[PDB]
Amino acid sequence: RSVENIYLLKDTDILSRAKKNYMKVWSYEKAARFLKNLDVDLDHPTLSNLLHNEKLYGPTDRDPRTKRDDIHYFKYP
Amino acid sequence: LRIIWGTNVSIQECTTNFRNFLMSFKYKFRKILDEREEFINNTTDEELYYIKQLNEMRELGTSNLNLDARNLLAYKQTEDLYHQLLNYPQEVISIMDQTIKDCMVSLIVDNNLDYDLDEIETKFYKVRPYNVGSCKGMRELNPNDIDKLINLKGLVLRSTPVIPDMKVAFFKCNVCDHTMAVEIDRGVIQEPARCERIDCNEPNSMSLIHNRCSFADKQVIKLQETPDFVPDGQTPHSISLCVYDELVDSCRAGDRIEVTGTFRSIPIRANSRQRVLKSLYKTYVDVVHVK
Ligand SMILES: [Zn+2]
C-alpha cells in the first residue's frame, strides 16, 4: 500500500522520500503485473503409486532432516 | 579363513560346499549310503535331484526347500557340513537360505531365461532340514545339547490358538509426531529415551501404539513323545513345540508326527517379584520341519 498513494506529505516514511529520490516503487499486485512481463513459473495424485512407493522408504511421515536411521549417511571421507 | 566366534563355521567355505552339493547331487549317492545299489535306477539316479527341485521351485513359485540331511551325509564334500548343521542350526540355516537364493538367481541368469528376476531377488527362501539323525528321546538330552537339531516323534495332544508375536514396534512421538519404527532384535525392543528428532526432544512424547505394530504368527503345540526307546519306569513326557509363520495351524490334535527343530532353553520369570528369573531354564523346541 501507499505506492505514491498517500497523496500527502509525510515526515518519517520511506515512501514519502520515494518521490524525491525517484527510487522506483510498485505494489505486490503491481509486482505481479510487472512479472506478467517476466512470467516466472510458480515452481521450477497417483494414490496407488504413492502407496506402492511407500512400500519403499516406509511411510513418508518422518522428520524432514538429515537423519532417518534407515540409511548410513556419509560421515568420513 | 574367518570362522565365526563360538562356532566352527566359515561363511565362505560353507557356502562353497553347499553350492557344490546342490550342483552335483544324484540320488544314486544316497542309494550307495543306503547300501541299496541293487535298486539303483537308471533314470532317477542319473538326474540331478536338487537342481530339478530348484527348477520346479522356480516355476511353481514356492519359497521353502526341504532338505534331507542324510543326502548331505551322502555327498563326501559336505560330510562336515552335516555336523556343522547339527551343531549350529541358525547360522548354517541362514547360510543355506542365502545360498538357495544365490543358486536360484544364478540358474536364471546362466540359462538367460525370459523369467524376470524381480520376484526372485525380492523373495526370501527358506531351507527346512529333516531326517537329522536319531531321536534319543528327551530324557537323554543333556544341557550341552542346547541349540542343536533334534528329531522328535509323538502324538499332538493340544494346539494353542494363534499368538501374535511383535516384530516391529510403532512408538509415536506425541509432540512432533516422530513415528519411528523399531524392529525387534534377539527378542529385545529399545525405547527412544527422548524424541529421536533433534529439534523436538520430549521423553514423555513416546506412547507405543499397540494396534499399528506388525506382528507374526506363533503357535505352541503340546507334543507327547513316543520315543523308539524308553528307559525303565519312565512315564511318557510332554514337550512344547513352538512353530512359526506358515507352519501355524498345520498340525492337528491326534496327528502322529515326526518333528525336527532346534532344542532351546529360556529363563522363566518367577512372577513373585517382577523381573526376577528362575535359575532352572524351561526347555522347548523350535520347529523347522514337520513330517
Ligand atoms: Zn518429537
Swiss-Prot record, chain A:
Job of this protein: Regulatory subunit of the CDC7-DBF4 kinase, also called DBF4-dependent kinase (DDK), which is involved in cell cycle regulation of premitotic and premeiotic chromosome replication and in chromosome segregation. DDK plays an essential role in initiating DNA replication at replication origins by phosphorylating the MCM2 and MCM4 subunits of the MCM2-7 helicase complex. DBF4 recruits the catalytic subunit CDC7 to MCM2 and to origins of replication. DDK also has postreplicative functions in meiosis.
Protein name as it appears in the record: DDK kinase regulatory subunit DBF4
Gene label: DBF4
Assembly behavior: Heterodimer with CDC7 to form the DBF4-dependent kinase (DDK) complex. Interacts (via PBD-binding motif) with CDC5 (via POLO box domains). Interacts (via N-terminus) with ORC2, ORC3 and RAD53. Binds to ARS1 origin DNA.
Residues where Phosphoserine is found: 48
Transmembrane domains' residue ranges: none
Induction annotation: Cell cycle-regulated. Protein levels increase as cells begin S phase and remain high through late mitosis.
Post-translational modification as stated in the protein's UniProt record: Phosphorylated by CDC7 and by CDC5.
Coverage span on the entire protein: 177 to 264 of 704
Domain of life from the UniProt record: Eukaryota
Swiss-Prot record, chain B:
Compartment(s) of residence: Nucleus
MF terms (GO), sorted A to Z: ATP binding; ATP hydrolysis activity; DNA helicase activity; DNA replication origin binding; helicase activity; single-stranded DNA binding
Statement: the UniProt record of this protein carries the keyword Magnesium: no
Keyword Mitochondrion: no
Role: Acts as a component of the MCM2-7 complex (MCM complex) which is the putative replicative helicase essential for 'once per cell cycle' DNA replication initiation and elongation in eukaryotic cells. The active ATPase sites in the MCM2-7 ring are formed through the interaction surfaces of two neighboring subunits such that a critical structure of a conserved arginine finger motif is provided in trans relative to the ATP-binding site of the Walker A box of the adjacent subunit. The six ATPase active sites, however, are likely to contribute differentially to the complex helicase activity.
UniProt superkingdom: Eukaryota
A GO cellular-component term linked to this record: nuclear pre-replicative complex
Further details from the record: Present with 8800 molecules/cell in log phase SD medium.
Organism encoding this protein: Saccharomyces cerevisiae (strain ATCC 204508 / S288c)
Keywords for this protein: ATP-binding, Cell cycle, DNA replication, DNA-binding, Helicase, Hydrolase, Nucleotide-binding, Nucleus, Phosphoprotein
GO terms (BP aspect): DNA replication; DNA replication initiation; DNA strand elongation involved in DNA replication; double-strand break repair via break-induced replication; mitotic DNA replication initiation; nuclear DNA replication; pre-replicative complex assembly involved in nuclear cell cycle DNA replication; premeiotic DNA replication
Subunit structure: Component of the MCM2-7 complex. The complex forms a toroidal hexameric ring with the proposed subunit order MCM2-MCM6-MCM4-MCM7-MCM3-MCM5; loaded onto DNA, forms a head-head double hexamer.
Protein name: DNA replication licensing factor MCM4
Annotated gene: MCM4
Shown segment, full-protein numbering: 177 to 467 of 933
Family to which this protein belongs: Belongs to the MCM family.
